[PDB]
């Protein structure tokens, strides 16, 4: 005959969802920078993350129904909101701005003079600041302005003790949960994954905030991947990941100086001081050769994805907000946008210098469209410079000529470009098996 015999500790996993904690690196424990935004209480990372490779195994992966990216998005939202709660509120900044220009001769730099409550509530002071044109809106004697989000939200100044640099972060599944790594070279997001391996903590992706492209990412695939639930769907965002990192040199020449302005008792807001030196503008420099070669690689894969070889025109963003139309990112503590139209203007049918992109700075920002909560980014002293290397593109196909345009806006796609190869599975160590064994009475 035959008899059942259950085994405890069986290698069985099933698709499931659970709250995943974090484990950040301890090298930042000597660079707290007063509780940096990304990591405050994250536990130290594992010194030797054991990525056990598995053989004779295959798991059905899905990066679009994946809930890891949803947890990432909600967690980043909650963390950003929590790091913004204790800082200085800027409700007294709503005031009639008697504002003029700064350019003496032939906007983007508005010298705004306004009133503000000093430390003593009885007394009131007259102070001035240099706001950007994108930061103020005209109300209809010189032209009086007011902050762009004064009538639709409450402006909160990010207290400058914290910094916005994307710290290498990790999502580690709890005990009894395994994270599967789709380590195979040729993977697109859906279908069986031949090389699947388990790991305790995630590969590690900086929480970068970006729109048109994907700064500081990682793609082991030698070719660009065209990842979308339906390439046939034109509206579907055709997520792209450049195989080769494209070095970008966005520099903010303006010598902005932080100017603390008292807005009440125990209340002070950091205004913008005189821009020392010539009045200039932020600009991003992309090597034309590198961008052309990477565009060649992406267009090759796009032609392979869409038919075999078809006319493909890289066009500028069809539409969106400032963040969507103009690629957005944080260089050295402040957020600014570049139209990136010199990057998407190549009409390709079958087959040294740097392209310079105009960049506009917008200090007051309400990113993630959380209406009712807008942040005021303080000025950062000195020239701001940061160098990154693009790894991904958020392209969207238009409705023999298939024209691609940048998209984005939705921030789930930012995380999906890196959590594409991971998934979470729970362990069910109980398993029934037939065995000739037989216990004694």
């Amino acid at each position: 005959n035959l008899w059942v015999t259950v085994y405890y500790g069986v290698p069985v996993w099933k698709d499931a969802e659970t709250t995943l904690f974090c484990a950040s690196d301890a090298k930042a424990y000597e660079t707290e920078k007063h509780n940096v935004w990304a990591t405050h209480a994250c536990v130290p990372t594992d010194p030797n993350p054991q990525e056990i490779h598995l053989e004779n195994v295959t798991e059905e992966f899905n990066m679009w129904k994946n809930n890891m990216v949803e947890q990432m998005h909600t967690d980043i939202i909650s963390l950003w909101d929590q790091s913004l709660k204790p800082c200085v509120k800027l409700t007294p900044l709503c005031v009639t701005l008697q504002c003029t220009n700064v350019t003496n001769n032939i906007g983007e730099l508005k010298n705004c003079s306004f009133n503000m409550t000093t430390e003593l509530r009885d007394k009131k002071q007259k102070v001035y600041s240099l706001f950007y044109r994108l930061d103020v809106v005209q109300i209809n004697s010189n032209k009086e302005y007011r902050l762009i989000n004064c009538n639709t939200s409450a402006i909160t100044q990010a207290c400058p003790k914290v910094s916005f640099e994307p710290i290498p972060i990790h999502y580690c599944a709890p005990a009894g949960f395994a994270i599967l790594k789709c380590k195979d070279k040729k993977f697109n997001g859906t279908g069986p994954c031949p090389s699947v391996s388990t790991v305790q903590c995630t590969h590690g992706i900086k929480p970068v905030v970006s729109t048109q492209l994907l700064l500081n990412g990682s793609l082991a695939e030698e070719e660009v991947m065209i990842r979308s639930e339906n390439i046939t769907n034109n509206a579907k965002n055709i997520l792209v990941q450049f195989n080769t990192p494209v070095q970008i040199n966005c520099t903010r020449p303006n010598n902005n100086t932080r100017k603390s302005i008292r807005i009440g008792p125990g209340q002070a807001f950091y205004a913008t001081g005189d821009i020392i030196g010539d009045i200039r503008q932020a600009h991003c420099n992309v090597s034309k050769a590198t961008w052309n070669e990477t565009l060649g690689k992406v267009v090759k894969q796009l032609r392979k994805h869409f038919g075999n070889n078809t006319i493909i025109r890289f066009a500028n963003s069809s539409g969106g907000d400032l963040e969507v139309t103009t690629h957005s990112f944080n260089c050295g503590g402040e957020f600014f946008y570049c139209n990136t139209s010199g990057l998407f203007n190549s009409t390709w049918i079958s087959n040294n210098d740097s392209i310079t992109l105009p960049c506009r700075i917008k200090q007051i920002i309400n990113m993630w469209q959380r209406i009712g909560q807008a942040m005021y980014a303080p000025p950062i002293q000195g020239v701001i410079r940061c160098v990154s290397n693009i790894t991904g593109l958020i392209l969207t196909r238009d409705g023999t000529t298939e024209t691609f345009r940048p998209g984005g806006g939705d921030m789930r796609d930012n995380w999906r470009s890196e959590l594409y190869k991971y998934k979470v599975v729970k362990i069910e160590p109980l398993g029934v098996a037939p065995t000739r064994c037989k216990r004694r009475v």
């Epitope: 639930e229 046939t232 969106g320 469209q369 409705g399 806006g409």
Partner: antibody
Framework: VQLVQSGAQVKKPGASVTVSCTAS????????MHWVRQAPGQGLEWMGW????????KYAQKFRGRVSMTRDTSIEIFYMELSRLRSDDTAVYYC???????????????????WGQGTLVTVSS | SALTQPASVSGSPGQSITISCTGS?????????VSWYQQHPGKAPKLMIY???KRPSGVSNRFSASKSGNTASLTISGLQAEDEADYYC????????FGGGTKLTVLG
Amino acid sequence: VQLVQSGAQVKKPGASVTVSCTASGYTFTGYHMHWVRQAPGQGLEWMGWINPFRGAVKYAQKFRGRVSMTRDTSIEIFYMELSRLRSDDTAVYYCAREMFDSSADWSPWRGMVAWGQGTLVTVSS
Amino acid sequence: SALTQPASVSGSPGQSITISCTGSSRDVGGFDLVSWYQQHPGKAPKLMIYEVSKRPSGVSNRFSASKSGNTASLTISGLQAEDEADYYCYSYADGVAFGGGTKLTVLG
């Protein structure tokens, strides 16, 4: 779910016509918003769809370079602007709201059940 | 219109008739996003079916719609007086596409 549209407008060819279409009765930033133009006596035509979240848009190949459509989350108003008018542009325009939220499998190309009253524009020489 | 609909149809109340939205292999045969709007006299077209054969609430069972390969079809059952409306077939041909619309008449 109800959508008020702007009143009738009279325009000259070569000018620019902009129309409004408010939103009420649902969450504003969770449903794509098609724009549909119907010429009097002809077939039904499409202009574009707006994603109110981040303001993502996508136009029609026949209308690329002329149409420009935006929105404001504050007042929940859908703005459709059409420039470089022609004789055939004389029509009544409709704004269509989807059935399902923007997160559905085929959300931006679903039935667009909710339709506004409609605004008619007269572009005559 | 890429969705080839016949010019017009006529009939009487009570019986059941059909209308077809014949398309190519890329609009209706390639994709299952078929639909059937109903334009009202000088008013907005309201779809009666929303997929290959899906209908939302707010429409009687007399509208049976399905796709016969490359030729999608709609059936008007138990014709009545209020059925005096033109019906537009809708499909996603790598983008929105509207049919030519068919005139329909009862007892007239």
